[PDB]
Structure 1
Amino acid sequence: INFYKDSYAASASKQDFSQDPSKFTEPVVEGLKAGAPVL
């Protein structure tokens, strides 16, 4: 229920379930395969 003329007056938006943890956990140019020696 938003009867105001400004879009920023609306309620909170809690429907963004998109994630990308790799940018914090695997920030390497070359990816690593499972079980293979990384180094």
Structure 2
Amino acid sequence: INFYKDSYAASASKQDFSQDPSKFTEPVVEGLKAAPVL
């Protein structure tokens, strides 16, 4: 329920389930063969 004219007035948006943990866990460009990395 949101009867306001400004969109930022809406309730919280808790449906963004997209994740990309590899920008934190694997920030190399050689994707490591799961085999030695070195």
Q: Normalising to structure 1: TM-score of the pair?
A: 0.91
Distance 2:29 2:17 in 1: 26
> What is the aligned length?
38
Segments of structure 2 that go 5 or more residues without pairing to the other structure are none
Which runs of at least 4 in structure 1 moved beyond 4 Å after TM superposition?
none
| Structure in which a larger fraction of residues adopt strand | 1
Q: Deviations for 1:1-39, whole angstroms, at most 9, x for unmatched residues?
A: 0000000000000000000000000000111111x1111
Identity %: 100
Q: Normalising to structure 2: TM-score of the pair?
A: 0.93
